[PDB]
């Protein structure tokens, strides 16, 4: 039951924040609805969920159009999959956030294809913090340069960082890796304006990510099922 699962997940986030001294409000729950039907998103909506994350462009665009044509206001849609250049226009025209800026050229494409009447597209720069086997995300050594270039693009708004750490079973390492992201995120925050989003943490490392300083966790299966 989606309404019940949403309650259980929000309770875990709330408990995790309180234990480490943070206010639960600091943690945004991103409900990841990739591969799940619109009817399931509609249940999450009827239960108060507003921010949804999708990974595949046409799947996400169809969902966005569906809920626009029902007139459901609110809703923030986050593109959290890898973005290839020949599908960037659909993202720039329909999505509210994109977490996967990992090269300047995809950012400038998004900037250029974003209609001027929409709000700036909120973007995070994706760090490959700990994953040998991923071609996604930049190294931390590249952050300052990419952030400067991206932050000039006027139809985008650089809001912080995202990372998908390598899968890790040890809590100690979950926290250390996440802390590395939190540190980079703080250092970014001193120099840049409106840095407020660390997209970090899924079901299995949720506690360490929150304790480390994440502002947003991405939960799919624990909400929608398998
Ligand atoms: C699929 C996905 C999630 C959610 O996955 P679950 O383990 O099913 O909760 C979170 N973040 C990203 C980037 C994803 O692709």
Author numbering: 3 to 228
Text taken from the publication that reported this structure:
The pyridoxal 5′‐phosphate (PLP) homeostasis protein (PLPHP) is a ubiquitous member of the COG0325 family with apparently no catalytic activity. Although the actual cellular role of this protein is unknown, it has been observed that mutations of the PLPHP encoding gene affect the activity of PLP‐dependent enzymes, B6 vitamers and amino acid levels. Here we report a detailed characterization of the Escherichia coli ortholog of PLPHP (YggS) with respect to its PLP binding and transfer properties, stability, and structure. YggS binds PLP very tightly and is able to slowly transfer it to a model PLP‐dependent enzyme, serine hydroxymethyltransferase.
We serendipitously discovered that the K36A variant of YggS, affecting the lysine residue that binds PLP at the active site, is able to bind PLP covalently. This observation led us to recognize that a number of lysine residues, located at the entrance of the active site, can replace Lys36 in its PLP binding role.
